[PDB]
Structure 1
Amino acid sequence: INAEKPNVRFKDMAGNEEAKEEVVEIVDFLKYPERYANLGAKIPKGVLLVGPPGTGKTLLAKAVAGEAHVPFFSMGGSSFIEMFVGLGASRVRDLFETAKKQAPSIIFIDEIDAIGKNDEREQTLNQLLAEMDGFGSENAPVIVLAATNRPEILDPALMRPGRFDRQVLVDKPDFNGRVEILKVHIKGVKLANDVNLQEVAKLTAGLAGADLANIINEAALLAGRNNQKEVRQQHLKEAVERGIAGLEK
Protein backbone atom coordinates (compact mmCIF):
# COMPACT_ATOMS: atom_id res chain seq x y z
CA ILE A 1 0.00 0.00 0.00
CA ASN A 2 2.95 2.33 0.87
CA ALA A 3 2.60 4.12 4.22
CA GLU A 4 2.99 7.52 5.90
CA LYS A 5 5.51 9.72 7.71
CA PRO A 6 3.02 11.99 9.57
CA ASN A 7 3.23 15.74 10.07
CA VAL A 8 3.12 15.81 13.86
CA ARG A 9 5.75 17.08 16.27
CA PHE A 10 6.21 17.12 19.96
CA LYS A 11 6.46 20.88 20.21
CA ASP A 12 3.58 21.09 17.71
CA MET A 13 1.47 18.65 19.68
CA ALA A 14 -0.59 19.83 22.68
CA GLY A 15 1.79 20.62 25.56
CA ASN A 16 2.34 17.10 26.84
CA GLU A 17 6.06 17.42 27.60
CA GLU A 18 7.02 14.71 30.15
CA ALA A 19 6.42 11.57 28.15
CA LYS A 20 7.71 13.26 25.05
CA GLU A 21 11.04 13.23 26.87
CA GLU A 22 10.90 9.46 27.17
CA VAL A 23 9.48 8.94 23.77
CA VAL A 24 12.22 11.40 22.72
CA GLU A 25 14.82 8.67 23.42
CA ILE A 26 13.16 6.49 20.74
CA VAL A 27 13.64 9.22 18.24
CA ASP A 28 17.34 9.47 18.76
CA PHE A 29 17.28 5.68 18.15
CA LEU A 30 15.68 5.78 14.72
CA LYS A 31 17.51 8.98 13.99
CA TYR A 32 20.97 7.51 14.69
CA PRO A 33 20.79 3.67 14.79
CA GLU A 34 24.42 3.78 13.86
CA ARG A 35 25.83 5.59 16.87
CA TYR A 36 24.46 2.62 18.78
CA ALA A 37 25.49 -0.05 16.31
CA ASN A 38 28.96 1.45 16.96
CA LEU A 39 28.96 1.42 20.77
CA GLY A 40 27.22 -1.92 20.77
CA ALA A 41 23.70 -1.99 22.26
CA LYS A 42 20.28 -1.27 20.77
CA ILE A 43 16.55 -1.88 21.10
CA PRO A 44 14.59 -2.83 17.94
CA LYS A 45 11.70 -3.83 20.25
CA GLY A 46 8.37 -2.17 21.17
CA VAL A 47 7.40 0.37 23.89
CA LEU A 48 4.06 0.52 25.64
CA LEU A 49 2.73 4.02 25.92
CA VAL A 50 0.19 3.46 28.66
CA GLY A 51 -2.29 5.73 30.47
CA PRO A 52 -5.98 6.75 31.05
CA PRO A 53 -8.41 7.62 28.24
CA GLY A 54 -7.34 10.57 26.12
CA THR A 55 -3.82 11.89 26.52
CA GLY A 56 -2.69 11.84 22.91
CA LYS A 57 -1.05 8.54 23.38
CA THR A 58 -2.55 7.74 19.97
CA LEU A 59 -0.96 11.09 19.01
CA LEU A 60 2.50 10.91 20.57
CA ALA A 61 2.46 7.53 18.87
CA LYS A 62 2.71 9.31 15.55
CA ALA A 63 4.71 12.17 17.01
CA VAL A 64 7.87 10.01 17.09
CA ALA A 65 7.63 9.04 13.42
CA GLY A 66 7.13 12.58 12.17
CA GLU A 67 9.78 13.59 14.70
CA ALA A 68 12.34 11.31 13.06
CA HIS A 69 11.28 11.68 9.40
CA VAL A 70 10.72 7.94 9.55
CA PRO A 71 7.50 6.12 8.45
CA PHE A 72 4.47 5.10 10.52
CA PHE A 73 3.13 1.79 9.06
CA SER A 74 0.45 0.61 11.43
CA MET A 75 -3.13 -0.56 11.10
CA GLY A 76 -3.29 -0.87 14.89
CA GLY A 77 -4.81 -3.63 17.05
CA SER A 78 -8.24 -3.65 15.42
CA SER A 79 -9.38 -5.49 12.24
CA PHE A 80 -8.19 -8.85 13.65
CA ILE A 81 -11.04 -9.35 16.11
CA GLU A 82 -12.86 -8.03 13.01
CA MET A 83 -11.56 -11.10 11.09
CA PHE A 84 -12.97 -14.47 12.28
CA VAL A 85 -11.41 -17.80 11.15
CA GLY A 86 -8.72 -18.34 8.44
CA LEU A 87 -6.76 -15.78 6.34
CA GLY A 88 -5.79 -13.33 9.10
CA ALA A 89 -2.04 -12.75 9.31
CA SER A 90 -1.47 -11.98 5.60
CA ARG A 91 -1.17 -8.20 6.07
CA VAL A 92 0.09 -8.81 9.59
CA ARG A 93 3.35 -10.68 8.93
CA ASP A 94 3.60 -8.97 5.54
CA LEU A 95 3.35 -5.86 7.72
CA PHE A 96 6.84 -6.17 9.24
CA GLU A 97 8.61 -6.79 5.90
CA THR A 98 7.40 -3.38 4.72
CA ALA A 99 9.28 -1.74 7.59
CA LYS A 100 12.14 -4.26 7.21
CA LYS A 101 12.30 -2.80 3.71
CA GLN A 102 11.60 0.87 4.41
CA ALA A 103 13.74 1.05 7.51
CA PRO A 104 14.19 2.41 10.19
CA SER A 105 10.49 2.88 11.01
CA ILE A 106 7.63 2.56 13.52
CA ILE A 107 5.10 -0.21 13.68
CA PHE A 108 2.39 1.12 15.96
CA ILE A 109 -0.22 -1.41 17.05
CA ASP A 110 -3.39 -0.07 18.51
CA GLU A 111 -4.96 -1.08 21.80
CA ILE A 112 -2.90 -4.23 22.06
CA ASP A 113 -5.81 -5.80 24.02
CA ALA A 114 -7.71 -6.49 20.80
CA ILE A 115 -4.91 -8.81 19.68
CA GLY A 116 -6.02 -12.32 20.76
CA LYS A 117 -9.72 -12.94 19.97
CA ASN A 118 -12.65 -25.68 17.60
CA ASP A 119 -11.37 -23.40 20.43
CA GLU A 120 -12.63 -19.94 21.47
CA ARG A 121 -9.31 -18.34 22.68
CA GLU A 122 -6.17 -16.19 22.00
CA GLN A 123 -4.00 -16.79 18.96
CA THR A 124 -3.29 -13.47 17.28
CA LEU A 125 -2.15 -12.47 20.72
CA ASN A 126 0.15 -15.46 20.20
CA GLN A 127 1.81 -13.80 17.18
CA LEU A 128 4.01 -10.64 17.31
CA LEU A 129 5.93 -12.37 20.11
CA ALA A 130 8.17 -13.84 17.45
CA GLU A 131 8.78 -10.89 15.25
CA MET A 132 9.37 -8.60 18.26
CA ASP A 133 12.25 -10.96 18.83
CA GLY A 134 13.33 -12.90 15.78
CA PHE A 135 12.30 -13.09 12.13
CA GLY A 136 14.02 -12.81 8.74
CA SER A 137 16.48 -10.85 10.87
CA GLU A 138 16.76 -8.66 13.98
CA ASN A 139 19.39 -6.17 12.64
CA ALA A 140 16.98 -3.53 11.11
CA PRO A 141 16.47 -0.29 13.14
CA VAL A 142 12.62 -0.57 13.40
CA ILE A 143 10.45 -0.07 16.51
CA VAL A 144 6.95 -1.04 17.69
CA LEU A 145 4.69 1.08 19.90
CA ALA A 146 1.26 0.28 21.24
CA ALA A 147 -1.08 2.15 23.51
CA THR A 148 -2.85 0.82 26.56
CA ASN A 149 -5.01 2.01 29.38
CA ARG A 150 -5.88 -1.08 31.40
CA PRO A 151 -2.41 -2.76 31.22
CA GLU A 152 -3.64 -5.50 33.55
CA ILE A 153 -6.20 -7.30 31.29
CA LEU A 154 -3.31 -8.43 29.08
CA ASP A 155 -0.97 -11.40 28.74
CA PRO A 156 2.15 -11.03 30.86
CA ALA A 157 4.42 -12.60 28.21
CA LEU A 158 4.31 -9.24 26.43
CA MET A 159 6.84 -7.88 28.92
CA ARG A 160 9.36 -10.72 28.43
CA PRO A 161 12.77 -9.15 27.60
CA GLY A 162 13.18 -8.69 23.86
CA ARG A 163 9.52 -7.73 23.53
CA PHE A 164 7.53 -4.97 25.28
CA ASP A 165 10.40 -4.14 27.67
CA ARG A 166 9.44 -0.53 28.45
CA GLN A 167 6.40 1.55 29.30
CA VAL A 168 5.84 5.25 28.88
CA LEU A 169 3.42 6.73 31.35
CA VAL A 170 1.23 9.37 29.73
CA ASP A 171 -1.57 10.52 32.01
CA LYS A 172 -3.92 13.23 33.15
CA PRO A 173 -2.03 16.57 33.38
CA ASP A 174 -1.32 18.25 36.72
CA PHE A 175 -3.35 21.31 37.85
CA ASN A 176 -0.30 23.22 36.69
CA GLY A 177 0.18 21.67 33.25
CA ARG A 178 -3.37 21.76 32.01
CA VAL A 179 -2.68 25.45 32.35
CA GLU A 180 -0.07 24.97 29.63
CA ILE A 181 -2.68 23.13 27.55
CA LEU A 182 -5.37 25.77 27.73
CA LYS A 183 -2.45 28.04 26.78
CA VAL A 184 -2.30 26.36 23.36
CA HIS A 185 -5.85 26.24 22.38
CA ILE A 186 -6.09 29.88 23.28
CA LYS A 187 -4.18 30.82 20.11
CA GLY A 188 -6.90 32.06 17.83
CA VAL A 189 -9.68 32.60 20.33
CA LYS A 190 -9.81 36.37 20.57
CA LEU A 191 -10.04 36.95 24.31
CA ALA A 192 -11.29 39.29 27.01
CA ASN A 193 -9.29 41.52 29.37
CA ASP A 194 -9.87 39.39 32.45
CA VAL A 195 -9.71 35.87 31.03
CA ASN A 196 -7.84 34.09 33.86
CA LEU A 197 -6.76 30.75 32.48
CA GLN A 198 -5.55 29.70 35.92
CA GLU A 199 -9.07 29.82 37.28
CA VAL A 200 -10.43 28.03 34.26
CA ALA A 201 -7.46 25.84 34.99
CA LYS A 202 -8.57 25.31 38.63
CA LEU A 203 -11.20 22.64 39.69
CA THR A 204 -11.61 22.67 35.95
CA ALA A 205 -9.34 19.61 36.57
CA GLY A 206 -9.86 15.83 36.46
CA LEU A 207 -10.21 15.77 32.69
CA ALA A 208 -7.65 15.01 29.98
CA GLY A 209 -5.87 17.32 27.49
CA ALA A 210 -8.43 16.85 24.67
CA ASP A 211 -11.13 17.66 27.10
CA LEU A 212 -9.54 20.90 28.05
CA ALA A 213 -8.82 21.45 24.38
CA ASN A 214 -12.58 21.18 23.93
CA ILE A 215 -13.51 23.45 26.92
CA ILE A 216 -11.91 26.36 25.13
CA ASN A 217 -13.40 26.23 21.62
CA GLU A 218 -16.72 25.45 23.32
CA ALA A 219 -16.64 28.53 25.52
CA ALA A 220 -15.86 30.27 22.24
CA LEU A 221 -18.95 28.83 20.62
CA LEU A 222 -20.97 30.66 23.24
CA ALA A 223 -20.65 33.77 21.14
CA GLY A 224 -23.15 32.56 18.54
CA ARG A 225 -26.42 32.85 20.43
CA ASN A 226 -24.77 35.93 21.87
CA ASN A 227 -23.35 38.08 19.12
CA GLN A 228 -20.22 39.09 21.18
CA LYS A 229 -16.50 39.62 20.77
CA GLU A 230 -13.95 39.37 23.65
CA VAL A 231 -14.16 35.78 25.01
CA ARG A 232 -14.69 36.30 28.70
CA GLN A 233 -13.99 34.13 31.68
CA GLN A 234 -17.62 33.33 32.41
CA HIS A 235 -17.61 31.77 28.95
CA LEU A 236 -15.11 29.22 30.15
CA LYS A 237 -17.19 29.21 33.34
CA GLU A 238 -20.01 27.59 31.47
CA ALA A 239 -17.44 24.77 31.10
CA VAL A 240 -20.53 22.55 31.15
CA GLU A 241 -19.00 22.87 34.59
CA ARG A 242 -17.51 19.36 34.43
CA GLY A 243 -19.83 16.98 32.51
CA ILE A 244 -20.34 13.73 34.53
CA ALA A 245 -23.39 12.27 32.73
CA GLY A 246 -21.05 9.96 30.79
CA LEU A 247 -20.83 6.14 31.07
CA GLU A 248 -24.56 5.83 30.17
CA LYS A 249 -25.27 3.84 26.99
Structure 2
Amino acid sequence: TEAPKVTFKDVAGAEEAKEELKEIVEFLKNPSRFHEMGARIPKGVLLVGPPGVGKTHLARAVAGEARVPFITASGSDFVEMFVGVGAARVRDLFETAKRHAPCIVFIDEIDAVGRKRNDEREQTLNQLLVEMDGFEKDTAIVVMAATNRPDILDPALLRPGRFDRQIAIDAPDVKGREQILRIHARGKPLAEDVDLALLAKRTPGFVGADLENLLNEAALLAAREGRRKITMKDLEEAAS
Protein backbone atom coordinates (compact mmCIF):
# COMPACT_ATOMS: atom_id res chain seq x y z
CA THR A 1 0.00 0.00 0.00
CA GLU A 2 2.50 2.63 1.20
CA ALA A 3 5.40 3.01 -1.22
CA PRO A 4 8.94 3.03 0.30
CA LYS A 5 10.72 6.19 1.50
CA VAL A 6 13.87 5.40 -0.51
CA THR A 7 14.77 6.59 -4.01
CA PHE A 8 17.71 6.50 -6.40
CA LYS A 9 18.84 9.75 -4.72
CA ASP A 10 19.55 7.87 -1.49
CA VAL A 11 21.71 5.23 -3.18
CA ALA A 12 25.37 6.19 -3.37
CA GLY A 13 26.94 4.73 -6.47
CA ALA A 14 25.60 1.84 -8.51
CA GLU A 15 25.24 4.13 -11.51
CA GLU A 16 25.57 1.34 -14.09
CA ALA A 17 22.85 -0.57 -12.22
CA LYS A 18 20.39 2.28 -11.65
CA GLU A 19 20.34 2.78 -15.40
CA GLU A 20 19.37 -0.80 -16.07
CA LEU A 21 16.63 -0.52 -13.48
CA LYS A 22 15.31 2.60 -15.20
CA GLU A 23 13.31 0.43 -17.57
CA ILE A 24 11.80 -1.50 -14.66
CA VAL A 25 10.85 1.76 -12.93
CA GLU A 26 9.11 3.07 -16.05
CA PHE A 27 7.03 -0.09 -16.19
CA LEU A 28 5.90 0.12 -12.52
CA LYS A 29 4.66 3.69 -13.01
CA ASN A 30 2.84 3.13 -16.31
CA PRO A 31 2.12 -0.62 -16.69
CA SER A 32 -0.72 0.24 -19.10
CA ARG A 33 1.57 2.23 -21.39
CA PHE A 34 3.94 -0.75 -21.71
CA HIS A 35 0.82 -2.82 -22.25
CA GLU A 36 -0.60 -0.79 -25.13
CA MET A 37 2.81 -0.73 -26.92
CA GLY A 38 2.90 -4.53 -26.95
CA ALA A 39 6.18 -4.36 -25.02
CA ARG A 40 7.51 -6.94 -22.53
CA ILE A 41 9.71 -6.79 -19.41
CA PRO A 42 11.82 -9.48 -17.65
CA LYS A 43 9.72 -9.43 -14.43
CA GLY A 44 12.51 -11.36 -12.67
CA VAL A 45 15.63 -9.46 -11.62
CA LEU A 46 18.48 -11.00 -9.67
CA LEU A 47 20.86 -8.38 -8.21
CA VAL A 48 24.29 -9.95 -8.18
CA GLY A 49 26.92 -9.00 -5.66
CA PRO A 50 28.85 -9.73 -2.43
CA PRO A 51 27.12 -9.58 0.97
CA GLY A 52 26.85 -6.06 2.37
CA VAL A 53 26.67 -3.78 -0.66
CA GLY A 54 23.07 -2.65 -0.14
CA LYS A 55 21.31 -4.83 -2.72
CA THR A 56 18.05 -4.82 -0.75
CA HIS A 57 18.42 -1.04 -0.37
CA LEU A 58 18.59 -0.53 -4.14
CA ALA A 59 15.74 -2.99 -4.57
CA ARG A 60 13.69 -1.06 -2.04
CA ALA A 61 14.84 2.02 -3.93
CA VAL A 62 13.22 0.78 -7.10
CA ALA A 63 9.81 0.43 -5.46
CA GLY A 64 10.23 3.97 -4.13
CA GLU A 65 11.37 5.68 -7.34
CA ALA A 66 8.19 4.37 -8.95
CA ARG A 67 6.05 5.09 -5.90
CA VAL A 68 4.81 1.48 -5.92
CA PRO A 69 4.70 -1.07 -2.99
CA PHE A 70 7.77 -3.09 -1.87
CA ILE A 71 6.44 -6.47 -0.68
CA THR A 72 9.14 -8.58 1.03
CA ALA A 73 9.70 -12.22 2.04
CA SER A 74 12.62 -14.34 3.25
CA GLY A 75 13.63 -17.31 1.15
CA SER A 76 15.25 -18.58 4.33
CA ASP A 77 12.09 -18.47 6.51
CA PHE A 78 10.19 -20.54 3.98
CA VAL A 79 12.77 -23.28 4.01
CA GLU A 80 12.53 -23.16 7.82
CA MET A 81 8.77 -23.81 7.97
CA PHE A 82 7.20 -27.28 8.13
CA VAL A 83 7.29 -29.01 4.74
CA GLY A 84 4.46 -27.64 2.65
CA VAL A 85 4.03 -24.50 4.73
CA GLY A 86 7.00 -22.76 3.14
CA ALA A 87 5.36 -23.30 -0.24
CA ALA A 88 1.87 -22.41 0.94
CA ARG A 89 3.26 -19.02 1.88
CA VAL A 90 5.01 -18.57 -1.47
CA ARG A 91 1.53 -19.15 -2.87
CA ASP A 92 0.22 -16.42 -0.53
CA LEU A 93 3.01 -13.94 -1.19
CA PHE A 94 2.17 -13.82 -4.88
CA GLU A 95 -1.59 -13.95 -4.38
CA THR A 96 -1.34 -10.88 -2.20
CA ALA A 97 1.07 -9.19 -4.59
CA LYS A 98 -1.36 -9.77 -7.44
CA ARG A 99 -3.83 -7.79 -5.30
CA HIS A 100 -1.43 -4.79 -5.06
CA ALA A 101 -0.08 -4.50 -8.58
CA PRO A 102 1.96 -2.85 -9.78
CA CYS A 103 4.64 -3.64 -7.22
CA ILE A 104 7.93 -5.28 -6.43
CA VAL A 105 8.30 -8.53 -4.52
CA PHE A 106 11.70 -8.85 -2.90
CA ILE A 107 12.58 -12.47 -2.02
CA ASP A 108 15.47 -12.21 0.41
CA GLU A 109 18.12 -14.93 0.48
CA ILE A 110 16.88 -16.63 -2.62
CA ASP A 111 19.96 -18.87 -2.15
CA ALA A 112 18.12 -20.52 0.72
CA VAL A 113 15.62 -21.65 -1.87
CA GLY A 114 17.72 -22.11 -4.99
CA ARG A 115 20.82 -23.74 -3.48
CA LYS A 116 20.71 -27.47 -2.64
CA ARG A 117 20.67 -27.34 1.23
CA ASN A 118 15.69 -30.92 1.34
CA ASP A 119 11.92 -31.46 1.22
CA GLU A 120 11.17 -27.93 2.40
CA ARG A 121 13.55 -26.30 -0.09
CA GLU A 122 12.31 -28.39 -3.01
CA GLN A 123 8.66 -27.72 -2.23
CA THR A 124 9.40 -24.02 -1.80
CA LEU A 125 11.52 -23.91 -4.97
CA ASN A 126 8.84 -25.69 -6.99
CA GLN A 127 6.05 -23.39 -5.75
CA LEU A 128 8.11 -20.29 -6.55
CA LEU A 129 8.73 -21.43 -10.15
CA VAL A 130 5.03 -22.07 -10.77
CA GLU A 131 4.17 -18.70 -9.24
CA MET A 132 6.60 -16.87 -11.55
CA ASP A 133 5.21 -18.71 -14.54
CA GLY A 134 1.74 -17.94 -13.25
CA PHE A 135 2.20 -14.39 -14.54
CA GLU A 136 0.14 -12.83 -17.33
CA LYS A 137 1.24 -10.35 -20.01
CA ASP A 138 -0.87 -7.81 -18.10
CA THR A 139 0.72 -8.59 -14.75
CA ALA A 140 2.42 -5.47 -13.44
CA ILE A 141 4.78 -6.73 -10.74
CA VAL A 142 8.52 -7.34 -10.94
CA VAL A 143 10.14 -9.93 -8.71
CA MET A 144 13.58 -9.04 -7.41
CA ALA A 145 16.01 -11.30 -5.56
CA ALA A 146 19.59 -11.02 -4.37
CA THR A 147 22.59 -13.34 -4.48
CA ASN A 148 26.37 -13.47 -4.32
CA ARG A 149 26.93 -16.76 -6.18
CA PRO A 150 24.50 -17.18 -9.16
CA ASP A 151 26.53 -20.08 -10.51
CA ILE A 152 25.30 -22.61 -7.91
CA LEU A 153 21.64 -21.55 -8.00
CA ASP A 154 19.16 -23.98 -9.53
CA PRO A 155 19.33 -23.23 -13.30
CA ALA A 156 15.52 -23.16 -13.39
CA LEU A 157 15.37 -19.97 -11.35
CA LEU A 158 17.28 -18.39 -14.24
CA ARG A 159 15.31 -19.69 -17.22
CA PRO A 160 13.53 -17.11 -19.40
CA GLY A 161 10.28 -16.06 -17.79
CA ARG A 162 11.84 -16.10 -14.31
CA PHE A 163 15.01 -14.50 -12.98
CA ASP A 164 16.37 -13.95 -16.49
CA ARG A 165 18.01 -10.60 -15.85
CA GLN A 166 20.99 -10.02 -13.58
CA ILE A 167 22.62 -6.84 -12.40
CA ALA A 168 26.06 -6.82 -10.79
CA ILE A 169 26.62 -4.59 -7.78
CA ASP A 170 30.11 -3.75 -6.55
CA ALA A 171 31.31 -2.67 -3.13
CA PRO A 172 30.13 0.89 -2.25
CA ASP A 173 31.99 4.07 -3.25
CA VAL A 174 33.44 6.52 -0.69
CA LYS A 175 29.90 7.90 -0.22
CA GLY A 176 28.15 4.53 0.02
CA ARG A 177 30.79 3.85 2.67
CA GLU A 178 30.28 7.14 4.53
CA GLN A 179 26.57 6.25 4.69
CA ILE A 180 26.83 2.72 6.04
CA LEU A 181 29.25 4.03 8.68
CA ARG A 182 27.06 6.91 9.76
CA ILE A 183 24.28 4.38 10.20
CA HIS A 184 25.95 1.71 12.35
CA ALA A 185 27.69 4.50 14.27
CA ARG A 186 24.25 5.37 15.59
CA GLY A 187 24.23 4.68 19.31
CA LYS A 188 28.04 4.61 19.50
CA PRO A 189 29.53 7.51 21.54
CA LEU A 190 32.18 8.93 19.20
CA ALA A 191 34.88 11.41 20.25
CA GLU A 192 35.38 14.78 18.56
CA ASP A 193 38.31 13.50 16.45
CA VAL A 194 36.19 10.95 14.62
CA ASP A 195 36.09 11.86 10.95
CA LEU A 196 33.63 9.36 9.47
CA ALA A 197 34.01 11.18 6.20
CA LEU A 198 37.73 10.35 6.29
CA LEU A 199 37.16 6.84 7.66
CA ALA A 200 35.17 6.02 4.50
CA LYS A 201 37.75 7.79 2.36
CA ARG A 202 40.33 5.22 3.50
CA THR A 203 38.47 1.91 3.53
CA PRO A 204 38.18 1.23 -0.21
CA GLY A 205 36.97 -2.23 -1.16
CA PHE A 206 35.21 -2.51 2.18
CA VAL A 207 31.68 -3.92 2.22
CA GLY A 208 28.95 -3.12 4.78
CA ALA A 209 30.23 -6.05 6.83
CA ASP A 210 33.82 -4.87 7.15
CA LEU A 211 32.54 -1.38 7.99
CA GLU A 212 30.23 -2.70 10.72
CA ASN A 213 32.76 -4.78 12.67
CA LEU A 214 35.39 -2.01 12.55
CA LEU A 215 33.01 0.11 14.64
CA ASN A 216 31.92 -2.76 16.89
CA GLU A 217 35.56 -3.77 17.27
CA ALA A 218 36.57 -0.15 17.89
CA ALA A 219 33.68 -0.07 20.40
CA LEU A 220 35.26 -2.82 22.55
CA LEU A 221 38.81 -1.51 22.45
CA ALA A 222 37.36 1.60 24.09
CA ALA A 223 34.85 -0.16 26.34
CA ARG A 224 37.47 -2.55 27.67
CA GLU A 225 39.74 0.39 28.48
CA GLY A 226 36.66 1.89 30.11
CA ARG A 227 36.51 4.99 27.91
CA ARG A 228 33.18 6.72 27.20
CA LYS A 229 33.95 7.37 23.55
CA ILE A 230 35.31 5.65 20.43
CA THR A 231 38.18 7.75 19.03
CA MET A 232 39.65 7.93 15.53
CA LYS A 233 42.55 5.82 16.81
CA ASP A 234 40.32 3.01 18.00
CA LEU A 235 38.78 3.24 14.53
CA GLU A 236 42.16 3.03 12.80
CA GLU A 237 43.15 0.14 15.08
CA ALA A 238 39.88 -1.80 14.68
CA ALA A 239 40.47 -1.82 10.91
CA SER A 240 43.13 -4.53 11.36
Query: Is residue 173 of structure 2 the alignment partner of residue 148 of structure 1?
Result: no
CA distance in 2 between partners of 1:217 and 1:20 (Å): 31
Structure 2, unmatched stretches of 5+, are none
Three-state SS of the structure 2 residue aligned to 1:128 is helix
Three-state SS of the structure 1 residue aligned to 2:123 is coil
TM-score by length of 2: 0.76
Deviation string 1:45-78 (CA, Å, 9 cap, x unpaired) is 2100111110111221211112211111222212
The structure that is strand-richer by fraction is 2
Structure 1, unmatched stretches of 5+, are 243-249
Decide whether the 8 Å contact of 1:71 with 1:105 is kept in 2. yes
Deviation string 1:203-248 (CA, Å, 9 cap, x unpaired) is x3332146447757987999996678xx98656533x123xxxxxx
Considering only aligned residues, what root-mean-square deviation do their CA atoms show, in Å? 3.5
Three-state SS of the structure 2 residue aligned to 1:48 is strand
Report the alpha carbon displacement of residue 164 of structure 1 after superposing the two structures with TM. 0.8
The structure that is helix-richer by fraction is 2
Identity in percent = 59
Task: Report the equivalent of 1:43.
Answer: 41
Decide whether the 8 Å contact of 1:200 with 1:236 is kept in 2. no
Report the alpha carbon displacement of residue 23 of structure 1 after superposing the two structures with TM. 2.7
Cα distance change, pair 148–223 in 1 and its aligned pair in 2 (3 A): same
**Number of matched residues?**
228
Deviates more, 1:209-218 or 1:66-75: 209-218
Question: Which stretches of structure 1, 4 residues or longer, exceed 4 Å deviation after superposition?
Answer: 182-192, 194-200, 213-228, 231-236
TM-score by length of 1: 0.73
Task: Report the equivalent of 2:125.
Answer: 125
Task: Report the equivalent of 2:14.
Answer: 17
Could you say which structure has the larger radius of gyration?
Answer: 1
Decide whether the 8 Å contact of 1:109 with 1:146 is kept in 2. yes
CA distance in 2 between partners of 1:32 and 1:94 (Å): 25
Mapping 1:28-177, distance limit 5 Å: 28-43=26-41, 45-115=43-113, 117=118, 122-135=122-135, 137-173=136-172, 177=173
